[PDB]
Amino acid sequence: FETMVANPIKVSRLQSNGVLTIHYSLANF
Amino acid sequence: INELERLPANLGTYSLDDCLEFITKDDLSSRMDTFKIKALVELKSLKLLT
């Protein structure tokens, strides 16, 4: 069990701040 | 500015409306910061004057 290097969770600062939640603005066919 | 910049940063409220929320030993009430935001809107509005 002592040979089980763990996985870092990286935050990536621009993802942490202001990410919103393109065809659904109908101007582009 | 030099009166607002000598307030302690650990400033917090205790309104008379936290009795309706039943805050336990560790519960983090949702009206704790109604004075520290107001004491930064003034301190940063008096630096964005020019």
Added chain:
Amino acid sequence: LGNGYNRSLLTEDYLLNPNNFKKLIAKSMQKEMQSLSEQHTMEYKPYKNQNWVEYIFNGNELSQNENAFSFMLQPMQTFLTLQSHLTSSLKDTETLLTINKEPVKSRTITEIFDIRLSEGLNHLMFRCEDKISHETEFMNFWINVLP
């Protein structure tokens, strides 16, 4: 439960602060405290500004499946000392103490060590065992030293 696996050795452990840190500064509002879990009272005594905390562990009604403990110390408090009251020094009991890897020998039943910590966490492994009766006990102290 392992509370019936309570400690038969290790009466008292003391993480009291050294007298060097007091003698080099001082030349007090005391607040004792106990934690609701059988024993391990924790007392301290600041004054309006040094603190000189002291962590005692009366292990007569602690368990032994729960060895490690964790607390937080302030950046002026880099030095520490123990006081290890065993039950009885019947045999040549081996008492070694590795902070991270380095064993600490002594100051010279009750044995005193000399502890000097660094920033960040620490391990501070401590154990006692008998040569003849062949029984071991362990203690661990996760000391978070503030930067």
Added chain:
Amino acid sequence: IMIDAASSFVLPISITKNVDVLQRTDEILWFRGPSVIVNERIINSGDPHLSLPLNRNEKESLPGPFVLGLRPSAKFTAHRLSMLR
């Protein structure tokens, strides 16, 4: 002095059988230091247990930590629940 270290880790083995009480990601989150238990958030700034006036070896076993934490009295809470409806 950096800021953008990871400081949380996840082990690959799914041990999610007896773990519904810990803090899950949605696995188990494993941090790089312990937690910090804080008894009461609000300091009681007067109270000569803490203020230490300069006038006049004694011990006192106070009931709980709740003396030092600004709790409201129950008559106001009943008055406000009466004002509720």
Added chain:
Amino acid sequence: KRILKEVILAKKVSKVPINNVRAFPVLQTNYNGSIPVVR
């Protein structure tokens, strides 16, 4: 401030109105983070 006290001691004026902000500033506990620093 003495005089406005004494009337409230003496006369008991019919309203003496109550208007408060219904909050007051208190200090709250602070604590460092427990994850150590990375250099």
Added chain:
Amino acid sequence: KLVDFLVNVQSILNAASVKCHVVDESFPAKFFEKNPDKIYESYCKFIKNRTTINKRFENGEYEPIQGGFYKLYHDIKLVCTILIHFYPQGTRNYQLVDKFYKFSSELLLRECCRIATELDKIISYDFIKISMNYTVPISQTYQIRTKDMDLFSSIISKSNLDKRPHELPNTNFKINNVLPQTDIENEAPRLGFVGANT
């Protein structure tokens, strides 16, 4: 003076019990009147051998005396231990009963209050000790040694009234106790430090 002092606790403990329905749980007579440290072992013996908390006030089971509130404390601790043992340790109705026990025990501890060391050999020689002492319950975290990373866990939400044996999803885990840090708050910086010009 003790007339309203039951009425207010009644109203508060009714209105603070909507989401969990602790007060409307079934509870028979259960005459223990014992040491509150024996409060689970006595009910364990009551399980081995062989009127709810809202209805106790409507029948007037509580007097304006010390026992008239000691019984109320006893009934709350019994119902909370029952609801802790009934659910698993991760459900929301476990943590609601734990929070309700904490809140009601804090509410009932107050308002009946209204109604050997070389360092000590130096300091007790050098200073005068006016003091203050109290009890808090500690909690636990887990402990893992990986390859040179030495991780920690979150706080287990296991209550202080659980009494179960310590289960472990891994035997390579370890367990530790977290001592709460408590003192006069270290002087926080001023607002000029928090929010200067960048």
